[PDB]
C-alpha cells in the first residue's frame, strides 16, 4: 500500500553574454 503524489515544477535561464 502506497499512494505517492510526487510531482515537480522547474525553471531555468542560462545567459552567457559576451557583449564587447
* Site residues for a second copy per CB under 8 A: 1-20
DSSP 20: -
Cell representation of residue 16: 552567457
Q: Give the angle subtended at the CA of 12 by the CAs of 6 and 9, to the nearest 5°.
A: 15
Amino acid at each position: 500500500s502506497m499512494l505517492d503524489i510526487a510531482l515537480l515544477m522547474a525553471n531555468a535561464s542560462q545567459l552567457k553574454a559576451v557583449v564587447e
